[PDB]
Symmetry: C2
Subunit: 238 residues, 2 copies
């Protein structure tokens, strides 16, 4: 058995494509053809499966809405369609002969050579990375707490402002701005919130920690495009 797959496809975000998988050497509708995804720096994922002719399809939940399988039992070519492509769909997809109709033998033994799909979203080209520390800040109500945010590049704009801001995200509530453009404190914020910094180094300081201050904090930047957030810092109680 041989499984032939289409060549690589450089796609446009939002496009959709149908990769084929031409099987030979065996009776095509006696076995399911299964598809596996492989993202760079990631493992191997199982998308789902199609039983040619036999009308039977099964999808990995995670790929439902994204993967749609069909099969031409005349040419013995199986196809998987990827709709509304985004950069995360950039991967190497494979078809493998897998389970067999009656359901005893189920191993993905024969593999296609794989199809490299690259979505041209410009995959996060030169995004500014904001490095927060600690990622966890356990404290005791009353303590002072500082959170650091380091950026890959200077957040100093030509125009003179430094667009680094800080948010407090509490579950069930939208991000609550606190300090914008480094130290300028947003309106309605208690004065226990301070912020200062320069270039790449910025700091958030809460003079005395209160119950209501507990949650995750994110620093942000609007100097370069795109606008990026930091990973977060869960200020928690000890």
């Amino acid at each position: 058995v041989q499984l032939q797959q289409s060549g690589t496809e450089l796609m446009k975000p939002g496009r959709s494509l149908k990769i084929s998988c031409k099987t030979t050497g065996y009776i095509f509708s006696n076995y399911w053809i299964e598809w596996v995804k492989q993202r760079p720096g990631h493992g191997l994922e199982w998308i789902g499966k199609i039983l040619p002719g036999g009308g039977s399809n099964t999808y990995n939940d995670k790929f439902k809405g994204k993967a749609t399988f069909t099969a031409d039992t005349s040419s013995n070519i199986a196809y998987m369609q990827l709709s509304s492509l985004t950069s995360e769909d950039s991967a190497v997809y494979y078809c493998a002969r897998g389970e067999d109709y009656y359901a005893y033998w189920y191993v993905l033994d024969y593999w296609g050579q794989g199809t490299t799909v690259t979505v041209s979203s410009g995959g996060g080209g030169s995004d500014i990375e904001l490095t927060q520390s600690p990622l966890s800040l356990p404290v005791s109500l009353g303590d002072q707490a500082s959170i650091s945010c380091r950026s890959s590049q200077s957040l100093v704009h030509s125009n003179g402002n430094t667009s680094l801001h800080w948010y407090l995200k509490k579950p069930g509530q939208s991000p609550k701005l606190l300090i914008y453009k480094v130290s300028t404190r947003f309106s309605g914020v208690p004065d226990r919130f301070s912020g200062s910094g320069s270039g790449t180094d910025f700091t958030l300081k809460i003079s005395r920690v209160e119950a209501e201050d507990l949650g995750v904090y994110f620093c942000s930047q609007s100097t370069h495009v795109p606008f990026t957030f930091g990973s977060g810092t869960k200020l928690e109680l000890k």
Copy 2:
């Protein structure tokens, strides 16, 4: 200023959905409306932004193909449309009033309350977790190495088989099946590859490691649906 969004949405995978953002209190066209995703257990992400009137646009590369922006210069409502939904779309989305037309102010200050989008991808029970051990395995060609794979549930099917297989993944090559249903060597794999296990504990042994064996090793199951893969173990030379 008030930014008010549409209510919680329970969607089918594949569904498409547009959520609105009714702004008030300010001149709708002086500021850009910017979008933010907040996925459960994840930090905050920036989807992009729209400038009402000209409809000028800016997407985070990652969201191109998923997010589509529009703006009603007459009703003063901003809209966001998410194409062919998959469960990674299950998150809370927010519209924030951000940058001004003149571009000297860029701060996400006023936030709509968030729209919770829940993509109904179902749930085929607790997917079988296959914990491999170790994750990295440095050796000397000639040494013997054994890799372990532990499943969350007994991989013993009622038909009596045990659907545990081991693959070898080498860059630029599809997975090379080595051992199936726990212990049978695949035609062609050299006999320095052996496999055994029972219930939830399984091991792959390579009596004498050759260069050609160096790569990443995945175990996988076909007993429980969905077929899962283990996270991998990198056999690397010392």
